[PDB]
């Protein structure tokens, strides 16, 4: 079995294991702040430096993975708390879209909301152009921010949210369990064929963004990950 | 929302929140030992005392849950390491089958391997009578120990195993992530309609068993659980 | 070469290869519980029955050794989690100090913290009388519980900790590597001359203790050992 | 704390986590064969793809590490069993020396035996030009194959050897424990200042080589590694 596993309880600038793209910043307390509160259309993304081989062309096997992380979003004054965070899986050469407008693209797609990635979003702003639900929500995105499936949710300012994600290679099911701070859990599951949507080697990470009038603190506090590919 | 959540880092024998059935015994270190090493066809089960309402007849809503626990199985001399542990969901009036032969029934079914429950088994012995796979395995059981679906696994004596289970009400998907001792993860998922297989109120718990020649240490070390039923 | 090697994956009460002193008790799962949770100044120790010859008077040779074990400490209610575990090397006639007060003496020293032994401690309580650091720590003790050298550490209740110790005869260096639950490793090393501090034949083992208000579960789960003395 | 940890029980071609350099080959059983038995001056090296940051320029902290691996060397007919294996730590841009003559350079140094690396060698051939001891031996190399310190050892054809290495940041002590096939352990320790000899980011790996007349099977069977840098 081919297994990749890591665990970050705090992050630091200068760690070869992590790739920073955009307005990312590592705070003194170990937290990663994804966007710059003073920039227009700010976009920040952090990825695990090492590419993970999620499926094999030789055997046709797809890996299963278990990951869990925790974030926090907080309101800053005079601005609309937007736009949110997205845990994504993209090709190994992934870069922030060329003329990114930040905002509702969450830093992973273009103006129409298209991109090459699969991910779980925690959207705090309703962009009608992307057919966003009228409330905050968690959604599964497959090559687009016009979510394949969404579930109502509620982002609480200053609250530490915990998430657990399991992807079963067999059923190709991606399930998410979000534990809010009030104790209640929110779940969403969807069948996604990683092998048909992504290349053999990909990179996992987080991305967040804002606009001109929408800005808020997007923090990543911890992240653990484990994937196992059955080699034959 | 109607939420039920508990967390046990250690168990104790005078806890009204726990029901002991069979040869269960609480060791001095807080662990629960499910079977009696010196009893033939030994069977032991532990259940959360309070019935959890998983579905409503009024709204037709089914609850979503997130639970994780860790156990350890260890070999004892001169005996075949058998038969295994099962995390199960059963009617609130659940009792050890009358005249249980222990062994391959895992303490939840009758001689043919039938019963009323839904669970995830960690089977360490191949019972051809229940169509068991030729290796150790994790399986999803629905009213029978002839698993609806199994995945090969490997039970390491004296190793602490961690499991995480997520059941998404919408897709009715039950997914399991088992983190072995060597870091490798094993997963299995299956669509199970709790509302059609179980009553409105059920009890969650664990069960293990042995035979005449098959006996081993079955321990439960910790258990956290959280379920949320949307009431409206 | 004169080599002594053994490996315990589980312990049992009628084993002539093991000496039990004090409140030691072997649980049904194979684990050794060093202290009695109901006794006031409780002290329990377990030693390998056979004396190991660590140095020759003939050829001034000292033995090199590689050992690794794993333990678990857990909080019990209403009591301060104290006092800790110590892996020690002592004269073959070693016995629990006469009139031992348990507590910060860790079962190996007198009231002032003096004794005849060398060992690695995993201290979970700061005894100012022994100049203990203000946090949990691992320390190297040479004839006293006022550690020659300490390193900060963190004891996690119910966590299985693994340790590996290497003593290099040439450099007389004792180095320890503690693998926390967390994945993080802690190390400490110190030059200790076994030949000048201990006699030719010694006994290896573990010891733990508690006080009136300080009590917790001290468990030893496994232990392998190999020593080689060059004879020529 | 910044921790990096991985565990390989078997290797595979096409794993992004591993860099193959030279005549390396992944056998069908999962073992890595470092040298080509049919090539003159054969050299093969395998490295962990991701650079590990061993020390910080910010806080003058150095990381501690614990690693253990197992190898096997086997005689092939008509050839001198040479030249050995070396576990090394080198700059992230490390490549096989231009114009390497294999043989006694072990694939990490030039003709004089100089290079930029720190490692532990398991030398099976006495090269007088590098002041090699007259017998097989384990040695600690610091920027040269003219070992800083060596200890006699004995390579047994077809025997699986296990090694454990601990580097304690504080004392800057590197200690090695080699468990031979017959149960006897061999140890060697040396104070090495990684911060003064190596850059902030390095790569860990293995290297082996042969000559025209000296060739043998050099295999790597498993490898686990964990390093922790105190960030603060
Ligand atoms: C100066 C100003 O008026 N700018 C806003 C833009 O910020 C706005 O874009 C959206 O803003 C919200 C937050 O208010 C979200 O971030 C959303 O994703 C953005 O699309 C655009 C469109 O409303 O219009 C005004 O210019
Ligand atoms: C004395 C002896 O040989 N008895 C065995 C039984 O223990 C055995 O029952 C099975 O035993 C295995 C372990 O070996 C499992 O526990 C299984 O569930 C049991 O059914 C029966 C049937 O094989 O036959 C021999 O008696
Ligand atoms: C009931 C109670 O308060 N008793 C305590 C003692 O337990 C205590 O002894 C020390 O206790 C700590 C744990 O809190 C360590 O075990 C220490 O080694 C013991 O000396 C004594 C002295 O502080 O006094 C109060 O009784
Ligand atoms: C055909 C033959 O005679 N070749 C040898 C060389 O192999 C030899 O090189 C050394 O070989 C030994 C093993 O016998 C080791 O691999 C050593 O490191 C090599 O230097 C050279 C020098 O002895 O000369 C003869 O050609
Ligand atoms: Ca949006
Ligand atoms: Ca079975
Ligand atoms: Ca103390
Ligand atoms: Ca040589
Ligand atoms: Mn959305
Ligand atoms: Mn089965
Ligand atoms: Mn101390
Ligand atoms: Mn050499």
Short mmCIF file of N, CA, C and O in Angstrom, two decimals, chain C residues 1 3 5 64-66 149 164-171 173 175-177 179 183-185 187-190 226-228, chain D residues 1 3 5 64-66 149 164-171 173 175-177 179 183-185 187-190 226-228:
data_model
loop_
_atom_site.label_atom_id
_atom_site.label_comp_id
_atom_site.label_asym_id
_atom_site.label_seq_id
_atom_site.Cartn_x
_atom_site.Cartn_y
_atom_site.Cartn_z
N UNK C 1 31.11 -12.39 21.98
CA UNK C 1 30.03 -11.45 22.40
C UNK C 1 29.04 -12.17 23.29
O UNK C 1 28.65 -13.29 23.00
N UNK C 3 25.44 -11.81 24.62
CA UNK C 3 24.19 -11.10 24.38
C UNK C 3 22.97 -11.60 25.16
O UNK C 3 22.76 -12.81 25.30
N UNK C 5 18.80 -10.97 25.28
CA UNK C 5 17.69 -10.33 24.61
C UNK C 5 16.35 -10.98 24.92
O UNK C 5 16.26 -12.20 25.00
N UNK C 64 26.69 -2.35 25.40
CA UNK C 64 25.89 -1.39 24.67
C UNK C 64 24.52 -2.02 24.68
O UNK C 64 24.41 -3.23 24.74
N UNK C 65 23.46 -1.21 24.70
CA UNK C 65 22.14 -1.80 24.69
C UNK C 65 21.12 -0.97 23.94
O UNK C 65 21.28 0.23 23.77
N UNK C 66 20.14 -1.67 23.38
CA UNK C 66 19.05 -1.07 22.63
C UNK C 66 17.77 -1.64 23.26
O UNK C 66 17.61 -2.86 23.37
N UNK C 149 19.60 16.06 33.90
CA UNK C 149 19.19 16.82 32.74
C UNK C 149 17.74 16.50 32.45
O UNK C 149 17.33 15.35 32.57
N UNK C 164 12.43 4.69 22.76
CA UNK C 164 13.54 3.89 22.27
C UNK C 164 14.76 4.47 22.94
O UNK C 164 14.94 5.69 22.96
N UNK C 165 15.58 3.60 23.51
CA UNK C 165 16.78 4.01 24.23
C UNK C 165 17.99 3.28 23.67
O UNK C 165 17.92 2.09 23.40
N UNK C 166 19.08 4.01 23.46
CA UNK C 166 20.31 3.41 22.94
C UNK C 166 21.43 3.88 23.84
O UNK C 166 21.54 5.08 24.12
N UNK C 167 22.22 2.94 24.34
CA UNK C 167 23.37 3.29 25.17
C UNK C 167 24.59 2.79 24.39
O UNK C 167 24.67 1.60 24.07
N UNK C 168 25.49 3.71 24.03
CA UNK C 168 26.70 3.36 23.29
C UNK C 168 27.86 3.26 24.26
O UNK C 168 28.30 4.28 24.82
N UNK C 169 28.38 2.06 24.43
CA UNK C 169 29.47 1.81 25.35
C UNK C 169 30.68 2.71 25.20
O UNK C 169 31.20 3.21 26.20
N UNK C 170 31.13 2.94 23.96
CA UNK C 170 32.32 3.76 23.69
C UNK C 170 32.21 5.17 24.20
O UNK C 170 33.09 5.66 24.88
N UNK C 171 31.16 5.85 23.75
CA UNK C 171 30.96 7.23 24.15
C UNK C 171 30.23 7.35 25.47
O UNK C 171 30.13 8.44 26.02
N UNK C 173 27.21 7.20 25.98
CA UNK C 173 26.10 8.10 25.75
C UNK C 173 24.79 7.36 25.82
O UNK C 173 24.63 6.31 25.19
N UNK C 175 20.90 7.81 24.96
CA UNK C 175 19.99 8.68 24.24
C UNK C 175 18.63 8.07 24.15
O UNK C 175 18.48 6.89 23.88
N UNK C 176 17.64 8.92 24.37
CA UNK C 176 16.23 8.56 24.40
C UNK C 176 15.43 9.28 23.32
O UNK C 176 15.63 10.48 23.09
N UNK C 177 14.49 8.58 22.71
CA UNK C 177 13.63 9.15 21.68
C UNK C 177 12.22 8.77 22.07
O UNK C 177 11.87 7.58 22.12
N UNK C 179 8.30 9.02 21.23
CA UNK C 179 7.35 9.32 20.19
C UNK C 179 5.99 9.54 20.78
O UNK C 179 5.34 8.59 21.20
N UNK C 183 2.71 12.32 17.03
CA UNK C 183 3.60 12.08 15.92
C UNK C 183 4.92 12.77 16.24
O UNK C 183 5.97 12.35 15.77
N UNK C 184 4.86 13.82 17.06
CA UNK C 184 6.07 14.57 17.43
C UNK C 184 7.02 13.73 18.28
O UNK C 184 6.58 12.92 19.09
N UNK C 185 8.33 13.90 18.08
CA UNK C 185 9.30 13.17 18.88
C UNK C 185 10.04 14.14 19.78
O UNK C 185 10.27 15.30 19.42
N UNK C 187 13.55 14.23 22.37
CA UNK C 187 14.76 13.48 22.62
C UNK C 187 15.55 14.13 23.75
O UNK C 187 15.34 15.29 24.09
N UNK C 188 16.41 13.32 24.37
CA UNK C 188 17.29 13.79 25.42
C UNK C 188 18.45 12.80 25.41
O UNK C 188 18.27 11.64 25.04
N UNK C 189 19.66 13.29 25.67
CA UNK C 189 20.85 12.45 25.68
C UNK C 189 21.78 12.96 26.76
O UNK C 189 21.78 14.16 27.04
N UNK C 190 22.57 12.07 27.34
CA UNK C 190 23.48 12.42 28.42
C UNK C 190 24.56 11.36 28.53
O UNK C 190 24.30 10.19 28.28
N UNK C 226 17.86 -5.72 24.25
CA UNK C 226 19.01 -6.44 23.71
C UNK C 226 20.26 -5.71 24.15
O UNK C 226 20.36 -4.50 23.98
N UNK C 227 21.20 -6.45 24.75
CA UNK C 227 22.46 -5.89 25.19
C UNK C 227 23.55 -6.82 24.71
O UNK C 227 23.33 -8.03 24.63
N UNK C 228 24.70 -6.26 24.36
CA UNK C 228 25.83 -7.03 23.88
C UNK C 228 27.11 -6.55 24.53
O UNK C 228 27.43 -5.36 24.51
N UNK D 1 5.65 23.13 16.86
CA UNK D 1 6.55 22.05 16.36
C UNK D 1 6.23 21.71 14.93
O UNK D 1 5.07 21.60 14.55
N UNK D 3 6.78 18.94 12.29
CA UNK D 3 7.10 17.52 12.15
C UNK D 3 6.87 16.93 10.76
O UNK D 3 5.85 17.19 10.13
N UNK D 5 7.01 13.11 8.91
CA UNK D 5 7.11 11.69 9.18
C UNK D 5 6.52 10.84 8.05
O UNK D 5 5.49 11.18 7.49
N UNK D 64 15.47 17.28 15.76
CA UNK D 64 15.89 15.99 16.28
C UNK D 64 15.19 15.01 15.37
O UNK D 64 14.16 15.34 14.79
N UNK D 65 15.77 13.82 15.18
CA UNK D 65 15.10 12.84 14.35
C UNK D 65 15.30 11.41 14.80
O UNK D 65 16.26 11.10 15.50
N UNK D 66 14.33 10.57 14.46
CA UNK D 66 14.34 9.14 14.77
C UNK D 66 13.99 8.46 13.46
O UNK D 66 12.98 8.79 12.84
N UNK D 149 34.68 8.20 12.39
CA UNK D 149 34.71 7.16 13.40
C UNK D 149 34.13 5.89 12.80
O UNK D 149 33.14 5.96 12.06
N UNK D 164 18.63 1.48 13.71
CA UNK D 164 17.85 2.55 14.33
C UNK D 164 18.81 3.70 14.59
O UNK D 164 19.91 3.48 15.10
N UNK D 165 18.43 4.91 14.19
CA UNK D 165 19.27 6.08 14.36
C UNK D 165 18.52 7.16 15.09
O UNK D 165 17.35 7.40 14.80
N UNK D 166 19.19 7.82 16.03
CA UNK D 166 18.57 8.90 16.78
C UNK D 166 19.54 10.06 16.77
O UNK D 166 20.73 9.87 17.00
N UNK D 167 19.05 11.24 16.45
CA UNK D 167 19.91 12.42 16.47
C UNK D 167 19.26 13.37 17.46
O UNK D 167 18.11 13.75 17.29
N UNK D 168 19.99 13.70 18.52
CA UNK D 168 19.46 14.60 19.53
C UNK D 168 19.98 15.99 19.28
O UNK D 168 21.18 16.26 19.45
N UNK D 169 19.09 16.91 18.92
CA UNK D 169 19.47 18.28 18.61
C UNK D 169 20.33 18.97 19.65
O UNK D 169 21.35 19.57 19.29
N UNK D 170 19.94 18.89 20.93
CA UNK D 170 20.70 19.55 22.00
C UNK D 170 22.15 19.15 22.11
O UNK D 170 23.03 20.00 22.16
N UNK D 171 22.40 17.85 22.24
CA UNK D 171 23.76 17.38 22.35
C UNK D 171 24.41 17.22 20.98
O UNK D 171 25.61 17.03 20.89
N UNK D 173 24.16 14.79 19.09
CA UNK D 173 24.69 13.43 19.07
C UNK D 173 23.91 12.55 18.11
O UNK D 173 22.68 12.51 18.16
N UNK D 175 23.35 8.75 17.14
CA UNK D 175 23.62 7.38 17.59
C UNK D 175 22.93 6.35 16.74
O UNK D 175 21.78 6.52 16.34
N UNK D 176 23.67 5.29 16.44
CA UNK D 176 23.22 4.19 15.58
C UNK D 176 23.24 2.85 16.32
O UNK D 176 24.19 2.54 17.04
N UNK D 177 22.18 2.07 16.15
CA UNK D 177 22.07 0.76 16.76
C UNK D 177 21.77 -0.20 15.64
O UNK D 177 20.74 -0.07 14.98
N UNK D 179 21.19 -4.04 14.54
CA UNK D 179 20.82 -5.36 15.02
C UNK D 179 21.11 -6.40 13.96
O UNK D 179 20.38 -6.53 12.99
N UNK D 183 21.23 -11.68 16.41
CA UNK D 183 20.72 -11.07 17.63
C UNK D 183 21.62 -10.06 18.30
O UNK D 183 21.15 -9.26 19.10
N UNK D 184 22.91 -10.08 17.97
CA UNK D 184 23.88 -9.16 18.56
C UNK D 184 23.73 -7.76 18.00
O UNK D 184 23.55 -7.59 16.79
N UNK D 185 23.81 -6.75 18.87
CA UNK D 185 23.72 -5.37 18.41
C UNK D 185 25.10 -4.71 18.39
O UNK D 185 25.96 -5.00 19.23
N UNK D 187 26.84 -0.73 18.06
CA UNK D 187 26.48 0.67 18.16
C UNK D 187 27.67 1.58 17.89
O UNK D 187 28.84 1.16 17.99
N UNK D 188 27.37 2.80 17.48
CA UNK D 188 28.38 3.82 17.21
C UNK D 188 27.67 5.14 17.39
O UNK D 188 26.47 5.23 17.12
N UNK D 189 28.36 6.12 17.97
CA UNK D 189 27.77 7.43 18.21
C UNK D 189 28.85 8.45 17.97
O UNK D 189 30.02 8.17 18.19
N UNK D 190 28.44 9.64 17.54
CA UNK D 190 29.39 10.71 17.26
C UNK D 190 28.68 12.03 17.30
O UNK D 190 27.52 12.11 16.91
N UNK D 226 10.96 10.23 11.22
CA UNK D 226 10.21 11.26 11.94
C UNK D 226 11.19 12.29 12.47
O UNK D 226 12.18 11.93 13.12
N UNK D 227 10.96 13.55 12.13
CA UNK D 227 11.82 14.63 12.61
C UNK D 227 10.91 15.69 13.19
O UNK D 227 9.77 15.86 12.74
N UNK D 228 11.40 16.38 14.21
CA UNK D 228 10.62 17.43 14.82
C UNK D 228 11.50 18.62 15.10
O UNK D 228 12.57 18.48 15.70
#
